[PDB]
Amino acid sequence: CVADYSVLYNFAPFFAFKCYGVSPTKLNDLCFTNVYADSFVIKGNEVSQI
């Protein structure tokens, strides 16, 4: 499918957008073999542990 990351920015005022292997600003100009998404909820003080 066409992966548009623009809908992620306006969805919520995120306060943590750490990206390790790719600069976020270029995310719209790349192609990937496969994508995995994982979701869970934790407390604030544990956020640094991810």
Binding site: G21, V22, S23, T25, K26, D29, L30
Partner: peptide
């Protein structure tokens, strides 16, 4: 490094990195 192609690095990371 992470790859042997310059264009891959220049199209995946910010200039500082």
């Amino acid at each position: 490094a992470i790859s042997s192609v310059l264009n891959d690095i220049l199209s995946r990371l910010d200039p500082p990195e």
